[PDB]
Amino acid sequence: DNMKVSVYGAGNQNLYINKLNLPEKFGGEPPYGGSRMAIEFAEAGHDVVLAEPNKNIMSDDLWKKVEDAGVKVVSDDVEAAKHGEIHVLFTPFGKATFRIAKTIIEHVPENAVICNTCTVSPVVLYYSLEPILRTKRKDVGISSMHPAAVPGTPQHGHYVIGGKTTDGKELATEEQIKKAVELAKSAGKEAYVVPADVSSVVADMGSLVTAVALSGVLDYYTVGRKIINAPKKMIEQQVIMTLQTMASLVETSGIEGMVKALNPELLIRSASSMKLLDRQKDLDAALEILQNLDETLKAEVEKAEIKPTTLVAAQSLVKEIKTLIGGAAAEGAIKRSARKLFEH
């Protein structure tokens, strides 16, 4: 099989080459990112169009690598939309990504699948398109194609594909997901389907936060259960509270407001009493980081406002709202509030 593929966004080569210095710290050669995905798809035998309105995003020498792979470059998103069975958004954060999705949705061929990469959760992308998806384009699927690294670097060995959500919702058909998986595999990459509501947390840049937070949770779980012999329910409740409270404070007050609310000084004193083993290098690392915060950050923390934040049991609250106003209205509330934070 070979497919018609559309990739949207060449990727910021100045970022990859000069900011991240990928060629020398990670490996490979430019171009990286979206234009590299297109190259790899074309070398896999696919019929590839790359949509990039900004010709200045890379030198002619790098554009040439793209053209030699057999990628057809267009400046018009709509032309790319009519071309592909599968559409890969390597698009700039924010309005650009949502704008491009909304631009192409009424032009993509029957049964097309639209996949986000780094820039947005597929559930959020789905929500932003839901009024069209539920009416005029019930054929179109939403998935994702998250690289494990920057495409073009040696470290990129797989894709995470957003599949059926943990609560059983299908954003794309099984056939559309299998086409996404086969597009990944055809490039010599591993391809893993992950529930779409979880996928961006394990593959986006914030996976940094996921890994470090998870390491603290497992540290506390181990120490709690094996040293302290704390009840498992107690440990889990405190974990939920910590993560939920931090999430909510960032949502209302930003990073600096959340730090102001938790108070690192206090936190360091308190967490110090949880040093039961020297095997806890995560706690060791955290304590030194919190004691040496960048100086401009601390100034902005003092200036920050802690906004009204409500303590909740989030999944329990979802169930409660369903019992009060019904499944349909509850889902409407969940969708509107998700779009307000993650889309605008």
Ligand X SMILES: C[C@@H]1Nc2nc(N)[nH]c(=O)c2N2CN(c3ccc(C[C@H](O)[C@H](O)[C@H](O)CO[C@H]4O[C@H](COP(=O)(O)O[C@@H](CCC(=O)O)C(=O)O)[C@@H](O)[C@H]4O)cc3)[C@H](C)[C@@H]12
Q: What is the DSSP string of 161-184?
A: EEES-TTS--SS-HHHHHHHHHHH
Of 101-120, binders to a copy of itself (CB under 8 A) are 119
Nearer to a copy of itself, 68 or 284 (CB): 284
Residue pair 138/170 in contact (Cβ under 8 Å)? The answer is no
Which single residue is written with the structure tokens 């599949």? 163
Q: Which residues contact 47 (CB under 8 A, 6 or more apart)?
A: 2, 3, 4, 5, 83
Sign of the alpha-carbon torsion through 35, 171, 199, 162: negative
CB of 295 to ligand X, least distance (A): 25
7 phi/psi in degrees, rounded to 5: -115, 135
Taking the C-alpha atoms of residue 160 and residue 146, their distance in angstroms, rounded to an integer, is 5
Taking the C-alpha atoms of residue 213 and residue 243, their distance in angstroms, rounded to an integer, is 9
Angle, CA 167 vertex, CA 165 and CA 168 arms, to 5°: 65
Pick the binder of ligand X from 239, 274, 290, 321 (CB under 6 A). 274
Pick the binder of ligand X from 93, 106, 218, 226 (CB under 6 A). 93
Q: Which does 62 bind (CB under 5 to 8 A by kind): ligand X, a copy of itself, none?
A: none
CB of 44 to ligand X, least distance (A): 21
Q: Which does 121 bind (CB under 5 to 8 A by kind): a copy of itself, ligand X, none?
A: a copy of itself
CB under 6 A: which stretch of 128-136, 143-151, 166-174, 212-220 binds ligand X? Answer: 143-151
CA distances from 99 to 91, 104, 121, 143, 240 (A): 10, 9, 15, 17, 35
- The reply to whether 268 sits near ligand X by the rule CB under 6 A is no
- The reply to whether 69 sits near ligand X by the rule CB under 6 A is no
Could you tell me which of 35, 6, 3 has the C-alpha nearest to residue 182?
Answer: 3
Tokens of 135: 């009416």
Residue pair 112/140 in contact (Cβ under 8 Å)? The answer is yes
Of 42-101, binders to a copy of itself (CB under 8 A) are 93-94
Q: Which long-range contacts (CB under 8 A, 24 or more apart) does 271-279 make?
A: 274/220, 274/223, 276/223, 276/227, 276/228, 277/223, 277/227
One-letter-per-residue 3-state SS of 260-284: HHHCHHHHHHHHHCCCCCCCCHHHH
Nearer to ligand X, 133 or 145 (CB): 145
- The reply to whether 328 sits near ligand X by the rule CB under 6 A is no
Nearer to a copy of itself, 103 or 252 (CB): 252
Pick the binder of ligand X from 62, 201, 217, 228 (CB under 6 A). 228
- The reply to whether 303 sits near ligand X by the rule CB under 6 A is no
CB of 24 to ligand X, least distance (A): 14
CB under 8 A: which stretch of 1-9, 34-42, 128-136, 226-234 binds a copy of itself? Answer: 226-234
CB of 322 to a copy of itself, least distance (A): 9
Pick the binder of a copy of itself from 2, 188, 293, 327 (CB under 8 A). 293
Q: Count residues contacting ligand X (CB under 6 A)?
A: 23
CB under 8 A: which stretch of 51-59, 70-78, 178-186, 261-269 binds a copy of itself? Answer: 261-269
Q: Which long-range contacts (CB under 8 A, 24 or more apart) does 224-228 make?
A: 227/276, 227/277, 228/276
Pick the binder of a copy of itself from 74, 96, 132, 271 (CB under 8 A). 271
- The reply to whether 198 sits near ligand X by the rule CB under 6 A is no
CB-neighbour burial class of residue 271 (10 A; exposed 0-12, middle 13-18, buried 19+) = middle
Q: Count residues contacting a copy of itself (CB under 8 A)?
A: 137
Of 229-248, binders to ligand X (CB under 6 A) are 229-231
Of 199-218, binders to a copy of itself (CB under 8 A) are 200-218
Query: Would you tell me which residues interact with ligand X (CB under 6 A)?
Result: 12, 15, 20, 92-96, 118, 148-150, 203-205, 207, 228-231, 270, 273-274
